[PDB]
Amino acid sequence: TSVWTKGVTPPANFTQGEDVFHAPYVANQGWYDITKTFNGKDDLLSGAATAGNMLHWWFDQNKDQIKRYLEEHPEKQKINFNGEQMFDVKEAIDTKNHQLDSKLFEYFKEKAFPYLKHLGVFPDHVIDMFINGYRLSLTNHGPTPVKEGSKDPRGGIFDAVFTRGDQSKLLTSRHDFKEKNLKEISDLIKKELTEGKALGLSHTYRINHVINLWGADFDSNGNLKAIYVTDSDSNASIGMKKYFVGVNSAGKVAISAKEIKEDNIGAQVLGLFTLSTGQDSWNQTN
């Protein structure tokens, strides 16, 4: 059985490479593959790249609503810092298909999180910041506090609708996997995918790396056999990668470009991040 993210067409151009079974990127298929250039600023930003890919998918899901929102709130289109333009969401939308130079990831690596040293930020926080304006704290290692507060100057583009402090307007979640088994992990991923959310996955590598999880294959018992992902560290020429999923010799659910076995323990999965469309939350009349 297979389950794919809402609005994402399964690639049909998979081929076995030297290290991985992969499908070269093809634009407008619903999925995204932001790719790092390791320019000193995006080197450890897999969390932000994964968030960027989720937001690009989100731009597609809410294309018309965003257009209407910007017509209602023209001042929200651009982010200006003391007279200087930092970001234009229309440019981000216009270049969303670009792997290496999308304007959203440019903003993330250049203005929002440049070098963030030997730190990194997770997808949920970045999205909560970008959309609702929730302040992103480098010292917060838990979920975003759902409380009222001032807007993070780096975001809050859509906060006239997706407010801070209102649970009905929070579009993300994070789930810890560390002490979960194959069935629990498989069940959650399937549920999140089936419910129409975009997924981000963290795994050991700061011993941490985040990737986009676009689809998954389950066996007859409902247990994951494989996942399809895009990884910001991979060359732009790679695209969607198929990863095997299996419990390794250390008793951990792990993923790898090759079968999980004694000689290939792979990477332990650590957590999951989700983004819902918020498609029924845009009406200003409620």
Side-chain angles (χ1 to χ4, degrees):
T1 307
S2 292
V3 183
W4 284 83
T5 299
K6 175 189 180 179
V8 177
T9 299
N13 61 324
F14 278 94
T15 182
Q16 179 62 53
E18 35 290 300
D19 307 318
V20 66
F21 188 66
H22 71 286
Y25 178 65
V26 174
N28 300 309
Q29 303 303 297
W31 56 283
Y32 293 86
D33 184 35
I34 287 172
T35 302
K36 297 171 173 183
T37 56
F38 294 89
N39 74 341
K41 302 185 181 173
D42 67 4
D43 301 34
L44 310 177
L45 294 181
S46 69
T50 296
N53 283 334
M54 293 167 69
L55 286 165
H56 285 169
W57 164 87
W58 196 80
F59 287 162
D60 287 336
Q61 306 314 303
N62 297 294
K63 187 181 177 190
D64 297 331
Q65 292 72 190
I66 289 167
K67 181 193 166 186
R68 167 197 172 187
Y69 175 95
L70 290 175
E71 295 182 323
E72 307 176 315
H73 311 278
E75 71 287 354
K76 286 296 192 176
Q77 177 185 152
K78 297 164 176 286
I79 290 181
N80 298 308
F81 276 17
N82 191 201
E84 308 309 308
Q85 180 172 306
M86 302 290 98
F87 181 71
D88 181 336
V89 75
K90 242 75 166 292
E91 295 190 336
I93 292 171
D94 180 64
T95 59
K96 66 181 176 65
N97 291 351
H98 307 174
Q99 293 170 105
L100 296 164
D101 59 0
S102 65
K103 287 281 177 289
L104 178 59
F105 195 51
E106 178 179 309
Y107 174 60
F108 284 176
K109 82 177 70 181
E110 295 301 324
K111 308 300 179 188
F113 318 115
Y115 306 103
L116 286 192
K117 196 79 69 178
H118 306 292
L119 198 147
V121 298
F122 290 124
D124 60 331
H125 287 186
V126 176
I127 294 169
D128 291 343
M129 178 199 82
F130 188 83
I131 298 183
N132 311 66
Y134 278 105
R135 284 186 171 182
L136 188 153
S137 171
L138 295 182
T139 47
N140 174 195
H141 306 305
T144 299
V146 177
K147 52 179 173 48
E148 294 188 306
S150 56
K151 185 194 64 181
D152 189 306
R154 292 168 297 181
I157 294 167
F158 300 99
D159 75 2
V161 166
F162 299 92
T163 61
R164 298 176 290 287
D166 186 339
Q167 189 69 53
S168 72
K169 296 304 191 312
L170 179 77
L171 307 181
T172 65
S173 74
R174 59 166 56 189
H175 302 265
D176 187 7
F177 278 158
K178 288 191 69 180
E179 115 205 279
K180 299 278 178 328
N181 58 28
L182 178 62
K183 178 183 178 181
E184 292 169 322
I185 292 176
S186 301
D187 287 347
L188 180 66
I189 283 162
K190 175 182 292 178
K191 174 179 181 292
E192 304 298 354
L193 285 171
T194 299
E195 297 182 344
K197 297 152 185 172
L199 283 55
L201 180 76
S202 55
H203 63 260
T204 59
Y205 215 48
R206 296 300 178 181
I207 311 175
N208 189 255
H209 185 67
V210 187
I211 60 181
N212 285 269
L213 199 171
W214 303 105
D217 292 335
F218 306 76
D219 62 27
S220 56
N221 303 311
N223 290 321
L224 283 166
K225 293 303 294 182
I227 60 175
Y228 300 90
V229 307
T230 47
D231 181 343
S232 63
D233 281 18
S234 297
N235 284 358
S237 68
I238 302 305
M240 177 110 289
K241 298 187 296 190
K242 180 174 192 168
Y243 275 2
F244 291 82
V245 176
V247 178
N248 65 20
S249 59
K252 311 294 187 184
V253 175
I255 58 179
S256 170
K258 301 139 301 169
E259 199 190 322
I260 296 299
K261 53 181 57 186
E262 193 66 27
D263 67 64
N264 181 241
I265 64 172
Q268 165 173 26
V269 297
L270 304 173
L272 194 77
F273 303 88
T274 66
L275 170 56
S276 62
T277 67
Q279 57 196 60
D280 298 330
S281 311
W282 298 90
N283 198 325
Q284 64 175 303
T285 313
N286 284 53

